[PDB]
C-alpha cells in the first residue's frame, strides 16, 4: 500500500488533456493500467508521472 | 442517411452554434464548426479525429462573436458570420462582383475552406492563415496579387485572437528570407533559401511521411510541404511563445510531436546575440567569435562577454590585392545590403566581389551540386552564427597581411 | 551602534524605513513591496535595479505598510499590524543567555546569534539564490540539505514548483531540478573539474568554485575574488539554474550560463534506456553502439520512450567495451565508484563483474582517476560536442 | 516653417537575459553607454531569454 512513479517523458506539452494522454501513453507502453498520471510540462517537454504500485 | 456531418454549405442553408452543426471533409480528416473559449464564440477548423481539440485555422479570431448566437451562411453571393443581433461580424470580402449562382461554400479534403462558383474559386482559407500551415499551403507570396500569406500566433493558450508573434517572409531584400518578429522587433530570422533547406533550421528534412519545397519563379515566393501518407498528420504553427515548430500527430506517444522548434538555441538563435563582424558558436565561450582577420571594437567589453559592438578588421581593406577567409559551416549573414546573381559560380563571384571595391563578403546561392550562383555583401555583416553539422562556406574579404593561404 | 547590528532594543519597521547593511556595503537588509504584499529581504546594496537574493518571510507575507523586526523574548521574529508573529527563527538551543543579537555579515550572511555563538543563519535557508561562500548541499553533522527554491513568478516571491537539490544516496552525489514532485533535470556528479550536466561553468578570473566532499560536508561553493564584481546562482521562475554576473557595460544581471541549456537534449530521459541523446543528429536519440531499437516502429516515429538493448547477449568472459566519446555520465543511483584504483584496473574489475554493464574514471583531471561502475540500464545520457567524458559500455565480443 | 522633418530612425541592442522591472530605462542607460549619446526612449521586450532593446533615435 502507498503508491510509486512510473516516468514517462518526450517533447512536447501537456495540452488541455496531459493527465488522460499520459494515462494512455502508460497503457500503450506497458499492458498496464495506471491509477492515475500526473503531467507537468516545463522545457518544452511532457513530463508523465504516473502512479503504479508500489 | 442524415444525421452526420457534410462537406457542403449552399446557399439556401446555413449553419448555427445552438444547431450544433459542422463541416466535415471528405476523408474525414477535418472538422468546420463552432467553438468556445475565452468566454468568446469562434468558426474554425480542427482534427476530426482527435480527441485533443487542435484548432489549425479560426475565421474570425480578432472578431469574436460575443455569445452562443452565432450563424453563418451566404449573403449576397457572399460568405458570412452574424452575431445575436443579425449583424455581421466577419466576410469573405469578395474578389469578383459578377459572381454567378449557384455559390457554394465547401470543405475541401486537405481542409482549404472555400467558396466557389460555376466559374472556380472566389475565396479560400488556405489563403488566410492563423498561426498554422497545412500540407498544401503557401507560406509566402502571390505575386501577381500581393498576397503574402503569414502567420500569427494566438495571444495566449485560451486566447484565439492576433498575438504578438509572426512568421513571415520578406522579400525586400538580396534574398527572402523568413522572419520572427514580436509586434515589430525583429526577433529570430530563419533566412534564406539554400536551396533544401532554410539556413537557419537545419532540423527541417525529407520524412518518410513528407516532402517540402521552396518555389521561387514568375508566379510565387513561397514554401509548402506535402504529405504523403494520408493517415499521417504533420503541420507547422508558430505558437504563442513565439516558436515556430513542426509538429506531427504521433499515436505511440499520444502527442503532437514536436519534430523540430525555432529557434532551437537560446544561446545563438536570437536575432544579433553577437555583434557585427562576429558569429556564435554554440561551443565555445565566449559564444561570439571575431571572424578570423578581426578584432573586438572594445575589449574590455568583449572580455565580459559584451558582444554588442562586434568587431573590426584588424588592417585596412587595400581592394587590389585583398584576399578572403573562409568561413565553414556558416549561418549567412542578413542580405539588407546583399545582391544575386544565381546563373554564375564560386570562382565567378570571387573575381566579381574582388573587383568591387565594396564587396566584404561572397557566397553561393545554392549548395546543390557542389554549389552554385553568387551572393555578394556590403558593409557590416550581422546575425551569423555556425553549426556543428550543417551550413555553408562564407569568404570574408581581408587585407593581404592577414590572410592565410 | 553598527549599521549591521539589531539588538534587543531595536527595530525594523516599515514605515521608518530602517535598514541592516552589511560591512563594505554589498548587501542591505530590510523590507520591500511586491505583489502588494510586505516582505522582509535582502538586496544589493549599490546596484539601482533591485535584485533580492533573499526572502525571509516568502510564504508569510505582510497585508500590509505596518510591520516590525525584532528580537523578542531572545528570538527573531516578524510581527504583523495586530503585534501577532508572522515569521520567526524557530531557535535551536535551551539555554540561551544575553546578549541575543541580529547580525548582516560582510558575505550576506543574515546571523542571530549568543555569547556561545550562532543560533540562526540565514545561509542555512537560502531563497532561490547561492550567495559566494554559501554551500549548496549536505550539511552532514545535521543532516540538513541547503538547496534552491524558485520565486513562482517575476512579482511573487512565495516557493514557486522549481528546486534545485543535491542528492547524496547513489553512488555520487547528483544536482537535480525538480518542478513539484516532477524529476524534471538531472545536473549529475562533480568530475571533478565541473558537473556532468552544465559544460559551460568554468573558473573565471574573478570567481572560482569546489565541490567539497568530506565527513562534515556534501555541498558546493564559489568565491568572488573582485569585490567590485557581483556573481550569483539562481534559478529563476521559470525553472532555469543560471550563473549572473552583473556587467555594467550591458546594464543587465548577465546570464554566463543556464540549465538546462538545451530543450532538445538536456531534459531528463528525454531518450529512452541504452540511447542517448546528441543534439547535431536526426533522431535526436542514438542507440549505443551494439544496441538496436527495442520498438522499431516507435523508434523511426521518433517515439524514444522504450530505448535500445544489446544486439548480442553478454557472455561475461570475453566480453569487450565500446568507448563513447563527450558523454553526460548516466545517472549513477545502480554505480559503485573506487577512487583509489584506476581506468586499466577499473575495466578488469568490470570484467570480472557479470553485473557490471559500463564503467568510467570517477575524476577527469590529470588523465583520469579514479572507477565508477554501473549495474543495469543506462539512463539519461547524451553527449556534447567538445566536452563531456568518456564512456565504456559493456558489449560481447563479437559486436566489439 | 512647414519644412520636412529629419527621418526617425531604430536602433537595435539585443543580449542574453531579460527586461526586468525596468527594462526601457536600462535600454535608454545600455544605448547612451554605447554611443555616448541620448536616445528619445527605448522599448524592451525579452522572449528568447534574450532581452531586445528597440531604440528611437534621429
Ligand atoms: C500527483 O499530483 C498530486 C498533487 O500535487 C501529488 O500529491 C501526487 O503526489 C502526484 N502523483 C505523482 C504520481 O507524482
Ligand atoms: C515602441 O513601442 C511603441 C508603443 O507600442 C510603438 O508605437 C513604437 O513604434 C515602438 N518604437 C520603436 C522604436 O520600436
Known amino acids: ?54 | 442517411a442524415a444525421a452526420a456531418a457534410l462537406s457542403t454549405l449552399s446557399s439556401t442553408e446555413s449553419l448555427t452554434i445552438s444547431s450544433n452543426r459542422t463541416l466535415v471533409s471528405p476523408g474525414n480528416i477535418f472538422e468546420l464548426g463552432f467553438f468556445r473559449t475565452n468566454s468568446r464564440w469562434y468558426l474554425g477548423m480542427w482534427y476530426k479525429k482527435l480527441s485533443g481539440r487542435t484548432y489549425v485555422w479560426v475565421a474570425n479570431r480578432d472578431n469574436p462573436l460575443s455569445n452562443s448566437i452565432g450563424t453563418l451562411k451566404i449573403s449576397n453571393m457572399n460568405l458570412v458570420l452574424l452575431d445575436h443581433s443579425n449583424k455581421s461580424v466577419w466576410s469573405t470580402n469578395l474578389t469578383r462582383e459578377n459572381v454567378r449562382s449557384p455559390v457554394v461554400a465547401e470543405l475541401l479534403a486537405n481542409g482549404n475552406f472555400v467558396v466557389r462558383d460555376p466559374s472556380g474559386f472566389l475565396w479560400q482559407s488556405f489563403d488566410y492563415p492563423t498561426d498554422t500551415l497545412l500540407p498544401e499551403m503557401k507560406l509566402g507570396y502571390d505575386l501577381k496579387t500581393g498576397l503574402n500569406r503569414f502567420l500569427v500566433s494566438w495571444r495566449s493558450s485560451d486566447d484565439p485572437s492576433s498575438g504578438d508573434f509572426s512568421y513571415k517572409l520578406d522579400i525586400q531584400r538580396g534574398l527572402p528570407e523568413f522572419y520572427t518578429f514580436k509586434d515589430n522587433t525583429l526577433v529570430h530570422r530563419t533566412g534564406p533559401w539554400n536551396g533544401i533547406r532554410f539556413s537557419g533550421i537545419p532540423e527541417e528534412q525529407q520524412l518518410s511521411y513528407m516532402v517540402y519545397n521552396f518555389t521561387e519563379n514568375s508566379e510565387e515566393v513561397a514554401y509548402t510541404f506535402l504529405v504523403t501518407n494520408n493517415s499521417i498528420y504533420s503541420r507547422l504553427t508558430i505558437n504563442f511563445s513565439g516558436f515556430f515548430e513542426r509538429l506531427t500527430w504521433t499515436p505511440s506517444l499520444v502527442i503532437w510531436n514536436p519534430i523540430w522548434s525555432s529557434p532551437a538555441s537560446f544561446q545563438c538563435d536570437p536575432y544579433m546575440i553577437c555583434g557585427p563582424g562576429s558569429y556564435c558558436d554554440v561551443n565555445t565561450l565566449p559564444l561570439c567569435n571575431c571572424i578570423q582577420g578581426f578584432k573586438p571594437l572594445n575589449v574590455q567589453e568583449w572580455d565580459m562577454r559584451d558582444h554588442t559592438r562586434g568587431c573590426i578588421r584588424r588592417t585596412r581593406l587595400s581592394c587590389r590585392g585583398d584576399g578572403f577567409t573562409r568561413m565553414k559551416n556558416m549561418k549567412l549573414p542578413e542580405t539588407t545590403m546583399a545582391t544575386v546573381d544565381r546563373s554564375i559560380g564560386v570562382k565567378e563571384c570571387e573575381k566579381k566581389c574582388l573587383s568591387d571595391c565594396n564587396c566584404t563578403a561572397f557566397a553561393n546561392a545554392d549548395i546543390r551540386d557542389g554549389g552554385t550562383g553568387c551572393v555578394i555583401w556590403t558593409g557590416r555583416l550581422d546575425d551569423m552564427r555556425n553549426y556543428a553539422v550543417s551550413g555553408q562556406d562564407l569568404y570574408v574579404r581581408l587585407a593581404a597581411a592577414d590572410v592565410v593561404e
Open chain 1, 1 to 54: 500500500r502507498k503508491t510509486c512513479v512510473h516516468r514517462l517523458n518526450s517533447g512536447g506539452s501537456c495540452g488541455k488533456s496531459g493527465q488522460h494522454d499520459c494515462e494512455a501513453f502508460y497503457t500503450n507502453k506497458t499492458n498496464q493500467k495506471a491509477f492515475y498520471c500526473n503531467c507537468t510540462s516545463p522545457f518544452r517537454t511532457r513530463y508523465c508521472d504516473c502512479a503504479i504500485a508500489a
